[PDB]
Design a binder for this molecule. Structure first.
Ligand code: C3A
Ligand code: C3A
Ligand code: C3A
Ligand code: C3A
Lengths: 243, 243, 243, 243
């Protein structure tokens, strides 16, 4: 997370950490608990090539990574069939936990936005995670969960921004319709935050509007963060995740 | 180049090396001379973002990288407007030299194929360059130019292989039409070769079938190398490079 | 620490972690509290060149590094004047805190040995620290304090083994007299433990016999670990630390 | 080599490069041809631990490393028996080639100074090699042989300088008697040069005064380069190398 702060221990009860087996269960991506037994994340975190479940684990809300670990096994990895690379799109996936988690005031699901919801450009949104605090510079120990308020921006203006200083023709889409963008040169998500949540408080309830996907560097000029637009894949998520 | 041998001094007179300014003029990609004032290379080597031309230099055929440098400055970088990422396509670009090159038998241009050339499986093709000799294994000094004979396979055959061991749906095209594939588990191009030529002798004439673009790793199972198909972009090329 | 286990919270109340200022206060060496205002460590951890005291802090016993930091500033760095490299010898040093620390059951000083104590082989000792768990293998987060029981061997036994497989003449002493030797191919201290303590339980009381100094690698064949012999420098220590 | 320039191909005909077997025969140290069949070098380049001759090779005077390799096998490695580490001293070794070389104007022995020679302070001397052009800064390709003119410094003065900004007591010897020193903050030898020659023109003839040994960094203030004084070991060298 770039330009942010350690998050209060009572914020973001849905933030999750994805672990991969090695010398130790190391964090490689974020995620969000959208259902007692399901984790929403980015497909490029667990694909396009098939992964071995035995090597994956899930860690729920943690103030400092690695400290109070209680890894949870994954029963299934569901990666959107239309996904190949994040720049192309469909960068969303689901993780079915082997057991439902006992939700608490400190650890519960986040709400999915209704199919009609349209997070207006400029809405107050937050992105959370243990990703780098800047380009090429890791989050220092004890690895606190960071947060930052990033302003959402219209898809067209973002697509436009990405063409500035680029050879790509103006009518060629870079930021596509199944994506959404947010952040500026001082606030953004970064390597290690992918798969994590982009939530906005609406009416008086927190809705996940995006999933940290990709972007050129972190907090770079005319290069805001790109996220998978959740509303766009609501039907695909609901084909697996109940209500 | 994976699985080749050092190339004889009399072969590949069109091979070039692109250098970027730094502690020394380092080789980052390959290229080919298609005209006394033009070089053809991969769009991802010099884009999608605009670069400082002054920081770029071109080196004509050399038996050993850095050994006998006579760097040539560049006046224009022309990247196919449809390009953004190699996996999406249009991974092609043009470099105009500030001065025309004097051709000879050791240094001359390569012949581009006729718009109808197909390069079917069983055609004799070679790929050259100063890239890695294997995944994460750089070409050791004195850095000789290497060459390797690569088997060409039909696009749909490679497309099917890229779907093996992956979540991407079978009907979701991976190896695209403006692409060409070649190589196997013992013969392939690798990192550092991008932008270089893939030439096949057709009726006593060498033709550049493709430009080294991308692949999942190098010489990996079910992951043949992918090259941008030159015949697909002849019209574009000719909008800049005279006949 | 190679070949050990996580130490229980009630053990090694004198262990300390030295921290150098940087993106975060990083651990570079161990140490021991021998007085409410003094810390004993290796001279190679802070010299032979003078350091900027401001960039150095001390962390008292922690079950896990970086998680419960309560860094303490240093006012003096006193390195034995005989020191230059660890191999030569006199690898001992003192740190004076700016304020005395409040002692308790979880954190108090270690008892220095009487001048006549030899710590003969057989007699079991332990070495503790947050160093690598093997050659080139870092202690994984959450970075627990480790401990390991190491067999003490006579100085001449170790000296003889250090000459095995070496060109150094047998009569050119390697393991010097102001040094002490312990550990084997399965139990040893490693990079990151230098400066820490080697303690042996004598008459129901724990005594610091050595200070983690050097060795050729960690837990390697015929290369037991080498520690500064604390009894050799008692007089020097008392020239600064009260009795 | 810090400071200095690429050497004319007619200079330093006795300089050699030591190669160790890996992905390619890589340069790890410099050396000098002092006899048709012998190479003088630094003990730490090939010790203290015993080495496998099969994995070692010698490359004679080359203008650009790796480009015109003609590796010569080594039959014997004689490391001075009093050597253990560069700081302690006796950092000198001998390499017996398996075949005498056919000396020429381009490649021939350097001459050893007479046991009486002293090389006064402020003497014009040159050190050469393919080592780093600066602290942590590799000599870039095409790897030209470099040279620099460095001023000899009186031993006492060097020892004195090494005590400035250090905790080592003033009467504790750092730069020992079997050592010699030269260089300043602009000119010095560096990592990659160790084992190389330090020659001075005396009475109109080139004599090797030292072997590149150690130093605190390269060209650092009050930290001149330390070399193994050759005159000091003439007797040891002549026990093997014919007069
Ligand atoms: C993320 O941090 C994002 C960055 C998001 C933008 C940066 C600034 N604005 C927002 N990802 C990123 O995708 O950028 C480029 C690609 C389109 C991130 N960090 O790392 C990645 C990529 C990645 C690294 C490592 C893994 C991994 O370990 N994967 C697998 C999963 C698995 C399960 C079981 C057993 C083994 C494995 C290995 C995955 C993805 N993106
Ligand atoms: C390439 O080596 C290729 C190899 C292609 C396949 C591998 C096996 N079968 C064939 N491919 C590759 O796709 O890399 C990954 C991304 C899609 C290659 N090497 O490096 C790249 C990418 C790349 C890295 C760094 C640079 C660079 O330095 N660029 C610029 C050029 C420039 C000019 C002036 C001033 C500054 C710069 C920076 C370029 C490309 N691909
Ligand atoms: C040690 O781990 C020891 C381990 C000892 C043996 C290995 C197996 N058996 C036991 N050994 C070691 O030999 O080190 C090298 C040579 C004598 C160790 N850890 O780290 C070091 C070396 C070292 C690294 C980094 C620093 C450092 O950062 N120092 C200073 C302190 C400081 C304070 C304030 C401002 C700046 C600084 C920089 C020091 C030493 N050895
Ligand atoms: C040297 O460059 C010296 C530098 C000289 C000073 C700099 C300014 N004043 C002079 N540096 C140095 O640090 O000296 C040693 C003591 C602290 C140098 N280059 O590399 C080294 C150390 C070194 C690196 C790599 C090897 C190596 O690979 N050795 C062997 C030889 C061998 C043969 C067969 C099979 C295996 C091997 C491994 C050795 C030494 N110092």
């Amino acid at each position: 997370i770039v330009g942010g702060q350690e998050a209060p221990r009572s914020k973001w009860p849905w933030q999750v950490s994805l672990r991969v087996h090695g010398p130790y269960w190391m964090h490689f991506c974020g995620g969000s608990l959208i259902h007692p037994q399901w984790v929403l994340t980015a497909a490029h975190c667990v694909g396009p090539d098939v992964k071995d479940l035995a090597a994956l684990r899930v860690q729920l809300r943690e103030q400092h990574l690695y400290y109070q670990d209680q890894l949870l096994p994954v029963s299934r990895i569901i990666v959107h069939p239309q996904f190949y690379t994040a720049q192309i799109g469909a960068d969303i996936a689901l993780l079915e936990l082997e057991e439902p988690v006992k939700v608490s005031s400190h650890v519960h699901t986040v709400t999915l936005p209704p199919a009609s919801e349209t997070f207006p450009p400029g809405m107050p949104c937050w992105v959370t995670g243990w990703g780098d605090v800047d380009n090429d510079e890791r989050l220092p120990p004890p690895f606190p969960l960071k947060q930052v308020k990033v302003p959402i921006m219209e898809n067209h203006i973002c697509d436009a921004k990405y063409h500035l200083g680029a050879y790509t023709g103006d009518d060629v889409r870079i930021v596509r319709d199944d994506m959404l963008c947010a952040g500026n040169t001082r606030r953004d998500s970064c390597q290690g935050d992918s798969g994590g949540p982009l939530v906005c408080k609406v009416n008086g309830t927190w809705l996940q509007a995006g999933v940290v996907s990709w972007g050129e560097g972190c907090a770079q000029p005319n290069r805001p963060g790109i996220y998978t637009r959740v509303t766009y894949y609501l039907d695909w998520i609901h084909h697996y995740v109940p209500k």
